[PDB]
Each structure stands twice: as C-alpha cells, then as structure tokens.
Design an enzyme around this catalytic site. Structure first.
Site, mmCIF file in Angstrom:
data_model
loop_
_atom_site.group_PDB
_atom_site.id
_atom_site.type_symbol
_atom_site.label_atom_id
_atom_site.label_comp_id
_atom_site.label_asym_id
_atom_site.label_seq_id
_atom_site.Cartn_x
_atom_site.Cartn_y
_atom_site.Cartn_z
ATOM 1 N N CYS D 51 0.803 -1.220 0.000
ATOM 2 C CA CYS D 51 0.000 0.000 0.000
ATOM 3 C C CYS D 51 0.843 1.281 0.000
ATOM 4 O O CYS D 51 0.299 2.374 -0.150
ATOM 5 C CB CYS D 51 -0.960 0.007 1.201
ATOM 6 S SG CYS D 51 -0.156 0.098 2.849
ATOM 7 N N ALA D 193 -10.903 -8.700 8.429
ATOM 8 C CA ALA D 193 -10.304 -9.171 9.678
ATOM 9 C C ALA D 193 -8.902 -9.749 9.494
ATOM 10 O O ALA D 193 -8.450 -10.551 10.306
ATOM 11 C CB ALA D 193 -11.215 -10.189 10.369
#
Lengths: 385, 251, 252, 405
Positions: D51, D193
């Site tokens: 990212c 999650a």
C-alpha cells in the site's frame, strides 16, 4: 628485509675524515665479504669517490644492520663510532633507490656522466663477489640505466673544476696520468695551454696520451723526480692513487720559490682522496694547498641546476624508482614462490606411491604447472601462497 | 628555542596559502571581514583582488590560516594600509606575481596592495601570538621544507609510529604516561609531535641535530635520530645530549 | 531564475558545515584586526565561539566564514553583530552543550562568546558584492537537508557520471558553444551547479531538479531520472518538450 | 557489468489514484516476473507491492535500456502514459538499490505495515519467487539478505518499539477527525479481519475503545481475534451485511483486498446520518490499495473519505528515535550492504571456477589416454591440486585467467 644506504658525504664530512673511509678498487670484494659476515647483512656494495664514500646493504632489521655497519666503519677507518654517527648519511629502501639514482644522474655535483663511470666499475668488480647479492646488484644495474637515460636526455667534473680553480692565480705540472690526470690535461687544453709536465710511473700512458693530443706539448719526468719539477713549476696537480701524502712540510719549505711572474706563490691542487699533500704543507707562506673540498668555489649558482633537475630529471628518477620497486619484491617471488614444486611434488609422489600399492603423474603435474610458471604480477604469486 | 623564527613561519604561511580574510572598517566604523585571494611578492607584501571600494579608511588586516595535518592551525594577521598602486609598471609587477601563482589573467583595476605595518603570528587557535616587525617579516625566508613537509609528515605517521613512540621516551622528559602520538609538522630546525595522554594532550618540539635544507637532508636526519633513539633504548651508546622539558597543553 | 536556495539558507548551510572563521575586531588604536576562531552555532544560526584575547571595549564585530565547494568555488558569509560574554549561567551551559555536541570537546567557559546577529552578508564566491540578509530571515532559514552529503555525491557523480553530466550540458542548457569539460560543483535541495569549460571561457550553470529534493535517496533518484531522460532524448527516443536553461555566470 | 535496478512509485512520489493502477497482488507476481524478464535487457525480476510501494527490482544488462523497457512495461500494464510514470518514477542502481530495499525491510521508510508484515512480505516475495524462473540468483540473494537485515534490525534494535504503522495511523486519524471525549461514543466498524484490520482493532483497543463491529468472510478468523483480545467486545458480521454495518457505524475502516471498491457513492448516500454526538459525519478510513472506497463517495456531504496517502497527516510522533533507532539500523544496513556487494562480486567467479575444472579435466584425460587405479590416481592428483585456488579474491580470478587462457 630492506635496502639501506649508509655513507659519508662532502656536504657533511671534511676530506680529512672521508679519506680514512676511502676504499680503493682493490679491497672492494674483501670489504663486501667482511660486511656480509655481520649477523644482519645478506648483501653489500661499496662506492668510494672523491666526494662520497657510501655503503649499500641489505638488512633483515634496519637498526641492527646500521649498528653493525657503523661499527665496521669505525673499525676499518679508526674513527670513533659516535663521531661517524654525527656525519652519517642514512636512507632506507625507496629513498635509498632515489638517492643512488640521483647520484648516478649526477645531481649531487660536484660528475655527469663521470659519477656513472664509477658505478659500472662497481658492478664489474662485484661480478665474482658472492656478497654482491641480487637486490643490491640489480639496484646498481638499474642505477646504471637511470644514469644513462638521465645523461643523454638532459643538460646534463672534479678535473675541470680543478683546472678552473686556476682563477685563484703556462708552467703547468700534473702528477698522475690516470683517467683523472688525462681529463685534467684535456681541460688544460680547453682553457688555452700548450705546456704540461706529466709525471707518471709509466711512459706508456703518457706517450699514449701524447699521441691523442698533438696540439699540446707533453714532457715526461720520472715519478721519483716529482720534487724537482715541483719547484720547476708554478702549479702542481696531484692525481695519484697513493695511500699516503707525497709532499709534506719537509719537501716544500726548502724549494726555490717560484717566479714572482705570477705572484711567487705555488699552488698545490690536490684532487685525490686519500690526499697527496697532507694539509700541513699550507703552512708555508710562499705556497698554498687546495684540496677537493675547496673545489666548490667554482660557480655558486643553484638557479639553473635545482630548477632543471627538479623539473626534468626527477620524473625519470621517480618512474625508474617505482619501476625498480616493482622489480624488487617481484624478483623475490620468483625463486621463492616456485616452492609450489615441493607442494605439487608432495601431491605427485604420494598419490602415485599410494596407487602403486609415472608418466601420468608427471604429465598432470607439469602440465598444470606450465600455466602459472611461464607467466599485478605480485598477486599472481601471493594468491597461491 | 628549536623552532623557526615567527617571521619565518609567517612567510611560510603566506607562501603556502592563497585564501584569507580582509578586515576593514566600514561607514559608522563597523568591522567587516570579507573573503579574499592573495599573492605575495619577494618581501612578503600581499596583493589582493577586490571588486568593491576600499573605503576612505585604508587601515586593514589580512588574516591567513594554514591547517597542518588536520591537527593545529598556524595563522597570521598582517596589519597595514590598503591601496591601489598608480604606476603601470608596478601593476605589471603585481599582475605577474598573480599570474605566476594562480596561472590566471587578472583584471588589473582590481589589484590592491597591503603595505605591511606588522604581523601577528599564532601557532594555533586560542593563542595570544607573537607580534612581528614588518622589516623582520620582509627579511624572513619561507621554510625550505614547506612544499614537502606534509608528505614527509604523512609518511612518518604511517610508516614510523614506533620511532615516534620511542622519541617520546628518549628525547623528551614526559613525566607521565603516553598512549598515542602523531607528527603534525616538520621544518628546517626540527619537528612537532602531538602526544595524546589521559592526563592531557600536549605538543612537543624535537630539534634536528643540525639545520636541514631539503627533503633528503630531513629524511636522513630523522633516520639518524630514530637510530640513536633505538641505540639508547637498548642502551648501547650513552645519551650524551639534552632532554626537552617544555611541554604545551592543548585540548 | 533562480532555482537556487535563498541566500539566507545558504548562509545557514555554510554556518552548519564549517567550523572555522575570522573574527574581525576593532582594536584599541582604531585599527581593524582579524583573528582565527572556531565556532559552533545554535538552533537560530547564532554563533557561539571561543576567543582567547581580552574581548576589547568596542563590542561591534564580524564573523567571516567560508565554504569551499569541490575546490572550484567558495560561498562565503559575514555575520555583523555585537560580541559579548553570555549573561546568565544557564545559557553558558546551553552553549557549552552545543559546543560539546559539535566538537566533542570541553572548553574554558570564560572563553565562550556570542555574536548577537545584526545582519548577514552572503556571497556566492570570491569577488562578488553579495546580498544582505536581515537577521530574522537568517534566523528562520533552514540549513540545506543535503549539506552533509553534497560533497560526497558531487564527487561520486564527477567520478562516475561524466557521460550524464556532459549530456546535461546539451539537453538541459541552451549553450551556444562546444563544451570542452564539465564538473559538478555543488548540489542542494533544488538542483545542482555545473562548471562548463569552453574555448570562449568558463561558465557556471544551475540546473534544477524537476521537484525539490529532501534526502540522499531523493537526490540520487532525481539525478538518475534526469540522466535517463537526457539519454532518451539524445538517443532520440523522446521529445524535448521542456525548456532549456539559458542563464550563465561568467567566471575567471 | 549487469546492474541491480529498482524502479518504482512510492507513497512519497505518487498519489494512490496512480499507484493502485500499478498495484500487483501476490497471485500475479510470477506472471509479472515472466513478462519483465521477457524484455531484451532484463535478466532477473521481482515485484514488491504494498500500500506504500510499487517497486520492481531487476537484474539488467544495460541500465538505461533496462529502465526504458521496464517503464514501457509499467505503462502497458497500468494504462498510465510513460510520461506520467516518468514524472513520478523512482530510480536507484546497484548499491543504492540494495541500501533502499534494506531500509524498506528494516522498517525505516515508515509508515510500517505493523507486526512483521513488511518483513513477512519480503519473505513472501522470496517464497513465491521459489518456483519462478525469472527470480534469478542476484535478486533472490538481494531479497534473502534483506530478510536477514529485517531480522537483525528487528531483534538487535528497538526501532520496532515506537513505530508508526498504517493501521495505528489510521485509527489516530479517525480520532483526530472526531470531536472531544474519551472516545467510545463513536461506533467503530472494521471491514476485513486480516492482519491490517487486526492491527486497527489492536490500536482501537489501545485508545480505550471497548466495542467494535468486525465484518469478514471467515468467522473463525474473527473468533480467533476475539480470543486474542478479550478486553474488547468484538461483534462478528458476514460480508453480505457490510452496508447494514456501515449504517450503524460512525467511522468505517476498510482493510480487505478487492480490485473493485466495496462502497460507492450510491451505497453511501442513502445511509442514515452519523450521530450528532460525534459531529454528524461518517468517516471512511480506507487503508487498502487498490482502494476499498470509491473516489465518488467523498461527494456525499455528510461523509468523509481518507486513504493511505492521508495518513501523512499523522507523521506527528513523539520520537527522539528519529535517528537513534534509525542509526542503530543504519549501522546494520551499511554493514550488510557491503556484506552483499561482496557476495555479488563473488558471483563473478563462477565462469572461471568452471573453466578451471574443465581445463584440468582436459589435461587429466589427455594424459590418461597416453597412460593406457591410475584412473583414480588422476582424479586424486587433480582434485588435491584444485582444493587450493577453487575455494579462494578477485586477483585470484585475474591470475587464473591470464595463467590458463
């Protein structure tokens, strides 16, 4: 190991001291032999000149080597070791090669190329001396090369200096028709003279010289008649290889005074080390003694000398210096690194005599050694070690 | 002393260096210092290139530094009056000094000269310095070893640490321990060593037996000293000389 | 153009990289005197320095500092202000702290002095007039983020990227002659300075990074990118849509 | 002769709208290594895709041509014109590139990916690289050594102690944008999650939060998280109830991997408004690249959107470790860099180390033919003679070269 130069120079030591260290071309091999007999010396060489007396050696350790050589100098000259230690010229390795190259090139004037002729004599005399090892001999041969290359490609003597020392004044007289005496005669011709009394032990050399210079008149007088032709002339050139003075207080103070046509004073130019006039002679009022030390009063000019030398000869000197430093450590990994034989042999024999429980083993080994042996070359050998 | 005269050091620095600060008094008499390149004639007298006016106040100083061995920095400040010479003969005489030093062609109307009144000479930062008469400064000679001193110093610091270490022991009266030493500078009379000790760092001046005039003489003299030091350590010959007692605290 | 850092910034950078200067004092008899001095600088560029002599009753004073770049050019600054011993015993400790951090040394606290900066004169090289910088702009200016690695990087590029540098002279600056030689002189957050030699003479040019640079890898990257684009233009893989630098600075 | 090159876009140099186009997920790493290596001057290849980063590491024949080729590939596969990439392109060669990837592995180029992750990612690059052909020896070595550096910096330094991570920074931003309280008033929701989301929860809990609604595919993943963090109430809800969860939430965290966004403007515009007690604004904190929240969503007046780029807003960190645990790492890195370049220099030995044992074999066979036990003798002699130079450093190569041809 390391190369060392240990000497005495005209720049520090006076002639009356240097002459005691003077070693004529005869004792050279004996000298080198004595020198190598010392504990920390493998190779040696001796250079004796009018201006310098230097010893070039190889030492395992520098300090003890210098110590031993200095004590040897004391013992052979009869000069107190500390007194030598004062006037001692000392240089190691690369600076030593630098110095000897400078000497060959003749920058240490007063010898170009006259100080080089005295080097070839050293390498030729040292031919049959086992004390003249590879390092020092190779160093001297390289010094010859540097000498020649600097001689031809530059500007580039004691005799001429002596002749020109007549400025402190025919009627000439030279004792000793050696190469030195012959040069003196030549420079007597150069500055316009046609009458010299050449006293020599042999008529052969004097007559041989007379046949080379038909313009100047050469008169031969016997060697034992040197005293008669001393008061018969105005200036005396002593150029002989005597180990003791030829003239003294006794011989000179009864002589009929030279003609006052040129002052009345007699000039004794002594261009030999050891001296031929013995210093004391100068105590007479009607004569004066000028030795090799007083041959620096010719031209006191360092404008052209220093500049030209530093800007022209020093590049050659440094190139050849680093070149010889690339010759030294390299030519010691040649007979020592081939110890790779003993390794290979150990592998050759064993493996064979293990298998036996021959052309093959020799073939493999020798063909595997053909490569490395025939051929940054320092890394070519150091890596194998 | 076994050091060269202050005037000599001053001349040496003025030969080896080429950059300095020119300090003048501006309007309202506020101090101004400004970077300047300089050349020096045979009497030590500096010529500079300025682009700006020299004010009506011609009183000035020229401060020059010489960092030695990355350790100490000898310095000198020439106090004198600044001006532009009128004679187109001395302008050439100066521009030739410039051309010789810098190998450059100089805009002639930028040449100024500082008439030397006197010179303050210092061994390092944080020192009072000794003042030097102008005539003294003028008659002094640059050190003959100046162009090769740095090389010899590096060589000796890299190849002769044992000799220096022994030098601290047999030549100077070090009434304390010695952990690390170097050589900072060498000149015609001798050389200077920096001794690192837990009790404090000191500078020592060890003289050559006789005056030296060149690199060869220097190396030979050094060799003689290291030899004699080795011979006195292992106690062969007596130490028939005098020990140095003058130390110099540094930080 | 300028594509250079602001002169204030240059002055701060000089004060951070250097450690030696000249203290101009107005001595007893109205004659100026320059004295060698070491100094360190606080977070505001204010110099604290060790002086040995008796300070003098006139407190007006100057500190002159040089930064030689790649042996080719020497930016300089001169701080004009008033020298004085520190007032409190606390600031003495703060300044002894900065001096400690910079030099790793201890020093006689009675030898510490401070130049309260009135104004700063910044010069690009010897023989320049220079520009004056207000003391508050000097105070708020930051030292160049590349200053500690500028010298090294200029050396690496000069030793390893001559083809790139030479090419830059062609594709990034609108010269009117044949470049016979080039060196990079210096590099900061905005670009770099080339010295270009020529039959005509010697010139200094400033070529800017496409974007302002912050750290070592940023500068290296920016440089790589400019090299890549210059090559791609020379080998005619790419158009030169960008404008060339025109401004040159003549140097003797 | 061949250079190691890193060519990429970073969170420093390029916006997320551009980087997410160049993003390459794990499943597609080998395909990319194949294509890259297909270019004329690219011999080896790897892709580090996070990212914060889209970086391509290549072993390349010419560095100019390698960079041109790879850039063209980046353009072809992303859709971004070559010129825009050039505007944002990051470029480092050789030692600079190894320095770079070691700094990245060491967590110095913060924001970090939290617990392991980045180190575990480099691990994964090596792991997936295992099979792939274009994952050559130089790049494999570089990455392995980078894993090592990651480990050294991890253990032998406290740089990992006070380190800003994407997740923590996200929670911090969420909290900066909310009003004033010991903030439990705001309804927290985490979508995804995984590791990043789990960290978002860790930090939510670290900021006093006592209840969070976790949306996920796996329920057991969320039960395991629940078991690790009993101090916080974790409500699990399935993916197909995402909106219903967003509806009942004041700030939504999205940390799932999805090539198309989860929330579009149409999804977000008809949600009930966030409570006035928290400003009446719904906060979508999107830490995924490619983004999980559409660009259009910000057009919703009562909604706000923050992506990874915006985490730059939280560089604010109380740290004198700005250089302390960064020079602690810098030492290890300047050590391991030389320790790697040495290895690459050692790789140049192989041709000589082969030709040597070829020449020796020619000699022993040519001699054994003139010969005809003995066949064992030849091997003994040759192999005992070879145990010397073959284990030994470049001067040895340069010697054997001119000594054997």
């Amino acid at each position: 190991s390391s190369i060392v130069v240990i000497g005495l120079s005209i720049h520090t030591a006076p002639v009356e001291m240097r002459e005691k260290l003077a070693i004529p071309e005869a004792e050279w091999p004996r000298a080198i032999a004595e020198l190598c007999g010392l504990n920390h010396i493998e190779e040696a060489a001796v250079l004796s000149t009018c201006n310098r007396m230097e010893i070039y050696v190889l030492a395992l350790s520098q300090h003890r080597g210098v110590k031993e050589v200095t004590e040897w100098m004391s013992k052979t000259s009869g000069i107190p070791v500390s007194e030598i230690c004062q006037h001692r010229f000392l240089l190691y390795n690369k600076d030593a090669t630098q110095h000897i190259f400078e000497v060959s090139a003749g920058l240490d004037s007063l010898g170009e190329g006259q100080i080089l002729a005295q080097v070839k004599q050293v390498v030729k005399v040292g031919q049959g001396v086992n004390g003249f090892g590879r390092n020092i001999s190779g160093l001297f041969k390289h010094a010859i090369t540097v000498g020649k290359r600097v001689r031809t490609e530059t500007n580039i003597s004691v005799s001429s200096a002596a002749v020109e020392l007549a400025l402190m004044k025919a009627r000439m007289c030279v004792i000793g028709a050696g190469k030195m005496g012959k040069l003196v005669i030549k420079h007597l011709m150069a500055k316009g003279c046609t009458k010299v009394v050449v006293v020599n032990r042999s008529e052969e050399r004097v007559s041989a010289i007379r046949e080379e210079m038909p313009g100047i008149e050469i008169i031969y007088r016997p060697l034992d008649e040197m005293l008669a032709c001393a008061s018969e002339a105005d200036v005396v050139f002593t150029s002989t290889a005597s180990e003791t003075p030829l003239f003294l207080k006794e011989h000179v103070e009864n002589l009929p005074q030279a003609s006052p046509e040129v002052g009345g004073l007699r000039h004794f130019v002594d261009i030999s080390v050891p001296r031929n006039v013995g210093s004391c002679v100068g105590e007479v009022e009607t004569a004066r003694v000028y030795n090799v030390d007083d041959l620096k009063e010719v031209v006191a000019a360092n404008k052209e000398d220093r500049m030209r030398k530093a800007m022209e000869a020093q590049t050659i000197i440094t190139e050849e210096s680093t070149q010889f430093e690339a010759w030294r450590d390299s030519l010691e990994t040649v007979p020592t690194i081939k110890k790779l034989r003993a390794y290979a042999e150990r592998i050759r024999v064993a493996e064979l005599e293990k298998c036996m429980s021959d052309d093959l083993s020799r073939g493999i080994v020798n063909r595997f050694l053909h490569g490395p042996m025939q051929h940054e070359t320092l890394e070519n050998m150091h890596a194998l070690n | 002393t076994h050091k060269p005269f202050p005037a000599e050091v001053s001349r040496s620095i003025m030969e080896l260096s080429s950059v300095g600060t020119l300090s003048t008094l501006t309007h309202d008499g506020w101090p101004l210092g400004v970077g300047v390149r300089f050349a020096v004639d045979k009497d030590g007298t500096p010529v500079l290139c300025l682009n700006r006016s020299v004010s009506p106040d011609k009183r000035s100083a020229l401060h020059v530094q010489l960092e030695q061995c990355g350790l100490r920095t000898p310095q000198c400040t020439i106090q004198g009056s600044i001006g532009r010479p009128g004679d187109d003969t001395v302008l050439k005489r100066l521009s030739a000094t410039w051309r010789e030093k810098f190998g450059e062609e100089v805009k002639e109307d930028s040449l100024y000269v500082v008439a030397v009144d006197r010179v303050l000479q210092m061994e390092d930062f944080m020192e009072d310095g000794i003042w030097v008469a102008s005539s003294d400064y003028k008659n002094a000679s640059p050190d003959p070893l100046r162009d090769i001193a740095e090389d010899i110093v590096n060589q000796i610091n890299a190849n002769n640490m044992e000799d220096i270490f022994r030098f601290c022991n047999v030549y100077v009266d070090l009434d304390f321990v010695v952990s690390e030493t170097k050589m900072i500078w060498m000149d015609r009379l001798g050389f200077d060593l920096r001794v690192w000790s837990p009790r404090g760092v000191y500078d020592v001046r060890i003289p050559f037996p006789m005056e030296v005039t060149d690199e060869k003489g220097a190396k030979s003299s050094f060799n003689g000293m290291s030899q004699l030091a080795w011979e006195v350590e292992k106690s062969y010959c007596p130490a028939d000389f005098n020990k140095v007692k003058l130390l110099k605290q540094v930080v």
